[PDB]
Write a protein that binds this ligand. Structure first.
Ligand code: GF1
Ligand code: GF1
Ligand code: GF1
Length: 262
């Protein structure tokens, strides 16, 4: 029990929900965990693994990211800010990857999942890079039901922090692919209220947010603090009632606690 864990515990108690945190500091490879081995519903944070899996495929198919995918009216789901522009046309796997990562487009995610052979294709890729915890079971939008105690479409903070580190700072992907993933994450449009809200403004970062039922509010980030080695930080949050409201502020507070303890 560190000072940091006690602060996170205090935040959790006043939040009404359940908080999970995992930090890896690549300066010394030390970790700070809070409910690090408990499962949480990933919601849109799973888009990172799907995008990464497609990047892996592109290592042996040089033109893969230029491959077109048909977007049909029936394909549109519940949040399609990019796909809606291209219905009855096509989008490339690059376009879909960027839409999924940077705008959290749910139709684009479904296309990535299809390209991987279904949710289990995403899980297969996680296993291939050494993540024995991640599981993707469903497509969008039902992967966001986030029912307490449900193991579907979940991971642990420890596992996601490790995987994010290997994808963005390690060798799970080819160099070109790693760089592309980082570029996409740093270009995210959805993250300014979440982990990054709790960080010193001078720092740089990329992230992927997620939200769902049970007021589930998630963020996973790769962070470059001024003057030191990168960090990986995962903050997952979820609440007892199905119609609970989002709490990005809790994620920001978690990140602030983590930042002050560095
Ligand atoms: C018990 C504790 C925990 O996470 O183990 N906890 C919750 O589940 C929610 C509900 C129970 C206490 C508080 C409300 C919030 C919390 O910290
Ligand atoms: C795209 C995704 C996300 O968290 O990134 N997402 C939401 O933002 C919420 C609102 C938009 C669609 C639904 C409600 C739920 C969802 O799937
Ligand atoms: C949102 C924005 C736009 O033009 O309005 N946009 C892009 O920047 C590119 C990349 C990000 C999404 C897609 C690929 C395409 C797009 O629609």
């Amino acid at each position: 029990t560190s000072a940091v864990q006690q602060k996170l515990a205090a935040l959790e108690k006043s939040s009404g929900g359940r908080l999970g945190v995992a930090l890896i500091d690549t300066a010394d490879n030390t970790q700070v965990l809070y409910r690090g081995d408990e499962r949480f519903p990933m919601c849109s944070t799973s888009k990172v693994m799907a995008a990464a899996a497609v990047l892996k495929q592109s290592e042996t198919q040089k033109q893969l990211l230029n491959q077109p995918v048909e977007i049909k009216p029936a394909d549109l789901v519940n949040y399609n800010p990019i796909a809606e522009k291209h219905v009855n046309g096509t989008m490339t796997l690059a376009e879909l990857s960027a839409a999924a990562l940077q705008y959290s487009d749910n139709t684009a995610m479904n296309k990535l999942i299809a390209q991987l052979g279904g949710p289990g294709g995403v899980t297969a890729f996680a296993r291939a890079i050494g993540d024995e915890t991640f599981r993707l079971d469903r497509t969008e939008p039902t992967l966001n039901t986030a029912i307490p105690g449900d193991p579907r479409d979940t991971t642990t903070p420890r596992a996601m922090a490790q995987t994010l580190r290997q994808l963005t700072l390690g060798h799970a992907l080819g160099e070109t692919q790693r760089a592309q993933l980082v570029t996409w994450l740093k270009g995210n449009t959805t993250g300014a209220a979440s982990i990054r809200a709790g960080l010193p403004t001078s720092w740089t970062a990329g992230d992927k947010t997620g939200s769902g039922d049970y007021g589930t509010t998630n963020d996973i980030a790769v962070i470059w603090p001024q003057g030191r080695a990168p960090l990986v930080l995962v903050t997952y949050f979820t609440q007892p009632q199905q119609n609970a409201e989002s709490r990005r502020d809790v994620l920001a507070s978690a990140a602030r606690i983590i930042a002050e303890g560095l």
